[PDB]
RNA sequence: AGUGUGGAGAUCGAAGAUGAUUAGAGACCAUUGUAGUCCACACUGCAAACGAUGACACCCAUGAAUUGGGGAUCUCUAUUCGCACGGGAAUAUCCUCAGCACACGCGAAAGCUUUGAGGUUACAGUCUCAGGGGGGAGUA
RNA sequence: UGCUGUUGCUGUUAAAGGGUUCGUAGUUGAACUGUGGGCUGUGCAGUUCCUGGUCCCGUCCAUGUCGGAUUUG
């Protein structure tokens, strides 16, 4: 069992792909995560540390066995779309645009929803649904930038929140590690789709 | 001249479930609202066949609130088919990702080190 | 676990469950209260049979220690790797 | 009774200062402390517009490349003069911590 | 002005420890200070400790594992007869079963329960539960 | 009204069998969001249920004074649990109707120790334990057996529908106002889960909520 | 602010005078004006003398700042100025001691928070001052 | 009546911190002289010898960079 470690393509596409930066400031917590600085002033997270936090991430999803359960959300346009791709493949429930206050604490509407966990692209912009999701016993696994508000999330993945591919890559590299361990993809081969498809729409 | 939320409603539901109505004609737009709809008086029909027709006009802008079923050429617009493209064109076969004078100490660190097709400046 | 009678008759009405970091109880009334279900795995990367679960009090999670907590309790279970 | 601020309207906080030497107000002549008075750093136009093109016609040297003087002077207001021009008004409590400060 | 080095001591132990943290560092040991601990660590309140030396006073560091409610220290230290165990364990102890009252006595710092079986009394110095 | 349509997981759990008991919706600390869970789980004979105040109150409008009634109900099994609801209504009728069911929500869990040696069954409060609603808290301390409930009128009550028959208290405050002393000693009697006693330190095994084992029993019923 | 003896006497200005205002209006407004305001030497000790928050000690999380001193760079090393009060002055990054300030918990609430009103019915670090319904009265 | 409060009150705004500082009677006052050993039988927790169920080494592939297997390893 050396399995689900991080190896040089993950590694790559991250690098590659820019996930790795931070905003020019910092948060009390998310200090343990983000290396040293650049001398744009951005804060270079540890490529170890959101390594593992993402398995972590994958191993709670994975032992959700309604994935019905599981409730992805963001407000952020950039993390619409790759809300909605993943929500297909692992089959996530997902909820996108403006969170409406009041869908996990009001029984009697017909949109209420009773999820067992939480994922969240923001702990900014989304605070409506994490601050909710402390009154029902919901656990939140977030991305996060080295600003994020950690306030009521239980795990906290570092990221390139901003942007749109650093987004797309980590709702990617998740549906690619909850899959491979629920579902039955094939390890040994690069996987299916495309980054591509996830990504933000704009004309 | 502002049309109360009946009007906005009901018109929104016609548009909604019919594009027979699609010129910018308020006759025509108005003559296709009084067989389908019932709203008992003839004002009601006058108002919502106006604003039926700013309705579908509009849709030629842009989309309006109450989307049409024509999401489904929407949404499979989005062409997935891409050489690789964009990951591998990241990589830029044998053109190094920029990384940072850190990123480096990041990646010599790493037990992984720094993954192949990767360069600094 | 709870208080016995003379008789050896256990009599508490339920056995709170103890936040694993802080080791507080968690009380009927406590709603943030979180279980985290990690889903344990073994070679080739297939889930199996997987019992570890955190338990974090609501105190925790509302200064946002929550991630800091399970972070070491992860490593104290081996479900992570320092480095 | 209640208190209104946590800053009683100064700009002095307990075990600063003490003393503050107060000043006259523009307009009333109110002895208020440097500290409480309204300051306004002003920069004003000798002359309106439309009489500026009047006189900036009428002057060999000035007008062209080189513009007229103006009139700088800082304003220290009582509070009560303050408000009745206007220059501050009274604001909604959650509203009343704002600092402008200088920004561009 | 350190009036009492357990007031200071037993302080930092109770307001780290209804703080959660893992471990306290208390600024300076002494003899009492270290055989309250000792007693704190007989019955399970706390986990370990390492009596740093400075030379001059001691810095103790202390592991909590999350057991103790609260740590006093009595300030004037009113004495104990063996017949007024009933005062201090009707007032400052929340049940009659799982405090501890702690005391210096001719045999030593022990409990109150220490004390009954061996049958001194002595001066008290602070409780645990 | 009519065979009720549960809006939650835990409401259908509970009307079918798979949810018993309180103590099991107390252990995974959980909204208990609507009523008739207790309805099921609690036998009936046991319910037991009074009002402890009702007081009118009155917001100033032009012309008169809208009055509203607010208004205390009080539940418990006569073991262990108990719960005290508040609502206000526009006459007393409505109101003692919201309160009724808002004391049901909020039923929780109370603790039974003994004041010496552990014999038959758990007479006290296990530890001194306060709670306070306002300017006034009450102290609730254990007690020998048979002393009876030692307090003012209003915590008698709240008091016998939790199960203990020997406490001391007493209750600082304004106790007049019974809005807040109502809930204090609820609070109080909150608390006596709360306390961590060297019985309850040993490691318990956790178990699966029960909306997660029967989370495919609730995905049928939901779909 | 007053008071005593000398000085000073520009401005402002209790009392005072005058003109307005007003039903009346020495009031508020305007032109004045004495004591005073200023100084030395003596008294007085009567403030919303306020942070309406006694003093000494401990514990206590966060973000950007600020005034002293010091240290590193000569993983952070770098900018601008150039015998003479100068192997200098300021800045940048980071740390540190000391000062004024812009999460828990507590509180009747307003609110307080490493500058406490927190760590208190789970009541105990030390010393001290004042309070005990409103008046009468800080009077006799 | 915890409305005299040692147990046990209150003092930013409700009654209540002296205007500040020095200071006697008075009260309070930092750490240290200090885990005694060994032998027997018996309960606890942290290097002989045996495992082959791991990672590391290596092999075969070589795969431009996210297969792998390989036996003694």
Redesign the pocket.
């Known amino acids: ?2 399995v689900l470690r991080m ?3 993950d590694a ?1 596409k991250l690098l590659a792909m820019r996930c790795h930066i931070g905003t020019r ?4 917590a998310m200090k343990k995560y983000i ?3 650049t001398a744009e002033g951005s804060h270079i997270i540890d490529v170890h540390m959101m390594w593992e936090k993402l398995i972590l991430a994958a191993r709670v999803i994975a032992a959700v066995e309604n994935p019905k359960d599981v409730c992805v959300c963001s407000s952020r346009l950039y993390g619409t779309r790759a809300i909605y791709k993943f929500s297909q493949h692992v089959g996530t429930s997902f909820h996108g645009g403006r969170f409406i206050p009041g869908t996990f604490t009001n029984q009697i509407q017909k949109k209420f929803v009773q999820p067992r966990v939480l994922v969240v692209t923001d702990p900014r912009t989304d605070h409506q649904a994490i601050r909710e999701a402390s009154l029902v016993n919901i656990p939140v696994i977030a991305l996060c930038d080295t600003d994020a508000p950690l306030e009521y999330v239980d795990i906290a993945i570092p990221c390139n929140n901003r942007g749109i591919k650093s987004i797309g890559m980590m709702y990617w590299l998740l549906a690619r590690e909850v899959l491979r361990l629920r579902g039955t993809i094939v ?4 996987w299916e789709e495309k980054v591509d498809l996830f990504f933000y729409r704009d004309p | 001249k502002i049309r109360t939320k009946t009007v906005k409603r009901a018109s929104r539901q016609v548009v909604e479930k019919y594009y027979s109505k699609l010129n910018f004609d308020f006759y025509q737009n108005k003559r296709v609202v009084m067989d389908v709809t019932i709203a008992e008086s003839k004002k009601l029909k006058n108002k919502i066949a106006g604003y039926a027709t700013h309705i579908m006009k509009r849709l030629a802008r842009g989309p309006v609130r109450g989307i049409s079923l024509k999401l489904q050429e929407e949404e499979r617009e989005r062409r997935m088919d891409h050489a690789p493209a964009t990951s591998d064109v990241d ?1 830029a ?2 053109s190094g990702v920029s990384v940072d004078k850190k990123t480096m100490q990041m990646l010599q660190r790493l037990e992984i080190g720094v ?3 990767v360069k600094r400046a | 676990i709870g208080m016995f009678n003379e008789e050896g008759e256990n009599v508490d009405l339920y056995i709170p469950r103890k936040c694993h970091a802080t080791n507080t109880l968690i009380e009927a009334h406590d709603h943030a209260a979180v279980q985290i279900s990690i889903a344990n795995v073994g ?1 080739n990367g297939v889930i199996n049979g997987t019992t570890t679960t955190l338990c974090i009090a609501g105190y925790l999670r ?2 946002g220690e929550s991630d800091h907590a399970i972070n070491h309790i992860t490593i104290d279970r081996g479900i992570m790797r320092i480095k | ?3 209104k601020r ?3 309207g100064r700009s002095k ?4 200062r ?1 003393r503050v030497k107060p000043i006259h107000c523009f307009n009333c002549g109110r002895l208020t402390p440097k500290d409480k008075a309204v300051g306004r750093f002003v920069v004003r136009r000798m002359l309106d517009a439309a009489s500026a093109r009047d006189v900036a016609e009428a002057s060999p040297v000035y007008g062209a490349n080189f513009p007229m003087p103006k009139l700088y002077m800082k304003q220290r207001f009582c509070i009560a003069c303050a408000i009745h021009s206007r220059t501050v008004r009274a604001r909604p ?1 959650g509203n009343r911590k704002i600092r402008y400060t200088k920004k561009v | ?5 357990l ?2 001591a037993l ?2 132990i ?3 420890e ?2 959660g943290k893992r471990q306290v560092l208390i ?2 040991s ?3 200070v270290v055989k309250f601990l000792q007693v704190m660590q007989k019955h399970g309140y706390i986990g370990e400790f390492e009596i740093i030396d400075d030379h001059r ?1 001691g810095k103790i560091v202390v592991n909590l594992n999350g057991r103790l ?2 740590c ?5 230290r009113f004495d104990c007869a063996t017949t007024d165990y009933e005062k201090w364990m009707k ?2 102890l ?1 049940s009659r079963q799982f405090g501890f009252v702690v005391l210096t006595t001719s045999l030593g710092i022990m409990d109150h329960e220490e004390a009954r079986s061996r049958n001194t009394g002595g001066k008290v110095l602070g409780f645990f539960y | 009204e009519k065979e009720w349509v549960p809006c939650t997981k835990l409401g259908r759990l509970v009307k079918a069998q798979k949810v018993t008991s309180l103590e099991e919706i107390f252990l995974f600390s959980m909204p208990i969001k609507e009523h008739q869970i207790v309805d099921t789980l609690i036998a009936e004979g046991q319910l037991h249920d009074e009002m402890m105040k009702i007081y009118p109150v009155q917001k100033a409008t032009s012309a008169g004074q809208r009055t509203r009634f607010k208004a205390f109900n009080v539940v418990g099994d006569c073991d262990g649990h108990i719960g005290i609801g508040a609502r206000v209504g526009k006459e007393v009728s409505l109101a003692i109707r919201a309160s009724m069911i808002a004391a049901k929500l909020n039923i929780v869990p109370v603790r039974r120790g003994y004041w010496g040696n552990k014999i038959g069954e758990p007479h006290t409060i296990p530890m ?3 709670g ?1 609603c ?2 006034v808290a009450v ?1 609730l301390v254990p007690a020998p057996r048979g002393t009876g409930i030692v307090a003012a009128p209003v915590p008698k009550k709240i008091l016998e529908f939790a199960g203990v028959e020997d406490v001391y208290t ?1 209750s ?1 405050g304004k106790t007049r106002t019974h809005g807040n002393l109502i809930m204090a000693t609820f609070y109080a009697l909150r608390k006596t889960y ?2 961590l006693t060297p019985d309850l330190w040993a490691d318990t095994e956790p178990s699966r909520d029960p909306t997660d084992e029967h989370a495919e029993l609730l995905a049928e019923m939901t779909t």
């Open positions: 069992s050396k190896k040089e393509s790559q400031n910092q948060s009390s290396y040293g600085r390890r040994s081969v690069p | 990589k076969i044998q993954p192949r097709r | 070679p509302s200064q | 009774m209640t208190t946590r800053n009683h906080p307990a075990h600063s003490g409590v | 002005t350190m009036m009492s080095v007031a200071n302080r930092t109770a307001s780290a209804r703080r600024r300076p002494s003899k009492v006073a409610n609260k006093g220290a009595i300030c004037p007032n400052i929340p | 001194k334990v306060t306070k306002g300017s102290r007493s600082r709360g306390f």
